[PDB]
Amino acid sequence: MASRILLNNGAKMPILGLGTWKSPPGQVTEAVKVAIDVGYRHIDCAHVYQNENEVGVAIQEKLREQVVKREELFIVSKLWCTYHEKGLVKGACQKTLSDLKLDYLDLYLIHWPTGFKPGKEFFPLDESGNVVPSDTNILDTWAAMEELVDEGLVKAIGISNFNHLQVEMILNKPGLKYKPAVNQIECHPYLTQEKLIQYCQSKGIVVTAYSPLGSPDRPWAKPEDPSLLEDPRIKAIAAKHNKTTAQVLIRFPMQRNLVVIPKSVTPERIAENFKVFDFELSSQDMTTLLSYNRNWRVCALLSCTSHKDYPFHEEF
Template sequence: MYNIFITLIVCVFCGTQATKIPDRLLNNGMKIPIVGLGAMDITEQAVRDAIDLGYRHIDTSHNYHTSDKKNWSEIIIGKVLNDVFKTGKIRRQDMFIVSKLEADYHQRQRVVVGIKETLTNLGLDYLDMYLVHHPNSSAPVNISITETWQGMIDVLQANLTRSIGVSNFNEQQIDEISKLGVIPVTNQVLCNPYVVQKPLLAYSDKHYTTLTAYSPIGGSRYPNLLKDPKLVEIAGKHKITAAQVALKFQVQRDVIVIPKANTLKYLKENLDLFSFSLTDQEIKDIEALNKRN
């Protein structure tokens, strides 16, 4: 564990103090900012604000909507990136853009269709990471995960993405696709203080992949997470928020986090994780909150 490299990301637009955001090393040698912006139900302004604040990792999917349900997340992210790149202050290589293959595209020959639609939406020539969003294909067609993974290898070899990974996979499924010769760089799963994922994290460390946590501060599944007395108690000791405790818990375990926020206040708060540390006992206390085996 602890394969973290420190990168100085300068906030070139907003004039605020530069934020040091650690990178997580991937098994292909690439580095990904350990804190990213989850872009489901996001607003265009939030994407702009996030980049202004220093976010360089944005996570979306082909089927994600904006918060008002009137547009697709990929499209508004592409619009913002186009504007940002035009200024010349941030280059394409400064950003780490992640999107996902949805179930309708699981046939090997359709994986390339899916990623090209995503790239068109984003206005990009390549992704930094492309994930299989779920192991199950759309009914009534039952596509094996190995067929889908072969399609993912195809788009990797075609340089349409720089890395490939999965989401919502278990250990056995990762073992199965890894036999094709390319190990996923990450497995993006539900992970927070109520769903600690300790066995899956141990598996990931052993098999040279990473874990990415979605809904790291609860999300719709655990809307009351940030009211948990233990998280509130720890937050009080450090003079921070319960959300920052939940996120720092992951960062100290080398877990990549992609919290969603649509307000400037919370976007800032979710980045402000590197001026404090949780104690070993606090990490154990948070792990004890786990509600799922």
């Protein structure tokens, strides 16, 4: 299968990337170095993950070592919710660039459609405990993102956790200069997202699937939540193809024409997770995995359910 998908900005994005949420700062430099050594060319980052400096140390080393050229890498980061104000977006991008040791990003995403009050706290909640919003409109945030393209700091802009109509708001924004290239959303067999994927693909927007393994290291997991890596039905499909459960869970979105970004800091698993271009799931396998949908989310942003722009009220 082809390793890179064409974006609506004319650049090609690797369909397999390395995730870095929850990767410890003491382990993520080695994790990104090993990932680049074994073939990965896309790294998914975010300022709110608090490890971009350490990701940058790895990228910089592999670039200086001439293990890879900058043009061959596809580096993604995300604008955090406390920087939606027009006057804060460039600084937020520039801090990410400085941390990552880069002079441009390949793709910069609005991390959530929800803007929060600016300040040192990433989740600034009022005496009572609810997120304090910003009044900045997300069409104005989008215009600020478009300026980053026109200034050369980013080659592509996109969105993340946007529901279908929020996508629609962006796409219908008066004066729209650049369409979003990507919508990065949670997607796996327990949250299959057919409606939202269809809408986005129909518009030339590429979808990236996050938490493709079900995020077993998510901070709020409970023993009684479903577990994709332990699902006997998924292990059965993996056994049939002589692959691991993780490899099936990574190959599944690839065959829906999605980009996928599994996280690991374990060198053996980083390597294993990339070995997904040598087998094919059947259509029957694909439909069977889709049938496991239960609308179950890893990331529901539970402190923001009353924000004007909370995304997960809408069906899709």
